[PDB]
């Protein structure tokens, strides 16, 4: 329904800039780092896989975690708690059938009590001031998807894949807007599967070019190459599945030729 595609797309753009976390928050977190976070996000990928949650719910949670850690110091022993309430909030917001709390407590190997997950849910709700409908990479990719000729599911999945990979590493993906990560990912997928490139229509629509997308595409290209050797592997496993057309098994291109 192009009736509102444009008004929505503009709105998501207004908003992505207001829901943005602050880029250098890890430097101020005395007791945590990007690897632990990466360990947390990696772990939420399986929890999502285990409960069969949407990718969308996945992205929302990580938006919540980054925003929650932008202004609150957390002891590592509490990282998983923060991440566990973020994922229950994303679930509640996005899912038809959200997993009940007892199960969220269940997958932490009873590391935290129900009371604590509920308390932490409130704390996050307060720090985010209930601002939960944040744009994410997923929400941008679906739109860009409409610009294919013809559609190509291998490409979709591969984009999704590259987007979801970018959740893993605050550094450097925190500095890129979600709509930019999605451009980078769409182009890299497309180029990879068919060799086509960022379509002129998406230039009209978004205002981004390969030129504007280069900086983020350069990081992502590396991530795609280094993927098989990355400490974290839940996403690569996930995308081996038929459900995503086995795109994790595809060979990245050695050069983009930008």
């Amino acid at each position: 329904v192009p009736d509102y595609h444009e008004d929505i797309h503009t709105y998501l753009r207004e908003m992505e800039v207001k829901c943005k976390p602050k880029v250098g928050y890890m430097k101020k977190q005395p007791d945590i780092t990007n690897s632990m976070r990466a360990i947390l996000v990696d772990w939420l990928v399986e929890v999502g896989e285990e409960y069969k949650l949407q990718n969308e719910t996945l992205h929302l949670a990580v938006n919540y975690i980054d925003r929650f850690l932008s202004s609150m110091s957390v002891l590592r022993g509490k990282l998983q708690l923060v991440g566990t309430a973020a994922m229950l909030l994303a679930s509640k917001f996005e899912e038809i059938y959200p997993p009940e709390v007892a199960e969220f407590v269940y997958i932490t190997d009873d590391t935290y009590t129900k009371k604590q997950v509920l308390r932490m849910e409130h704390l996050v709700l307060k720090v985010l001031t209930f601002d939960l409908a944040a744009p994410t990479v997923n929400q941008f990719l679906t739109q860009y998807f409409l610009h294919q000729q013809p559609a190509n599911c291998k490409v979709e999945s591969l984009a999704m894949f590259l987007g979801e990979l970018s959740l893993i590493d605050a550094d450097p993906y925190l500095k890129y807007l979600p709509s930019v990560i999605a451009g980078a990912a769409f182009h890299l997928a497309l180029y990879t599967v068919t060799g086509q490139s960022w379509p002129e229509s998406l230039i009209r629509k978004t205002g981004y070019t390969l030129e504007s997308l280069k900086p983020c595409l350069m990081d992502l290209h590396q991530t795609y190459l280094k993927a098989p050797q990355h400490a974290q592997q839940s996403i690569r496993e996930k995308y081996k599945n038929s459900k995503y057309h086995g795109v994790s098994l595809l060979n990245p291109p050695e050069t983009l030729n930008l």
Binding site: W43, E50, G77, I107, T108
Partner: peptide, 10 residues
Amino acid sequence: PKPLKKLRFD
């Protein structure tokens, strides 16, 4: 399953 686990960071 693999999903459930206490995340250790120390």
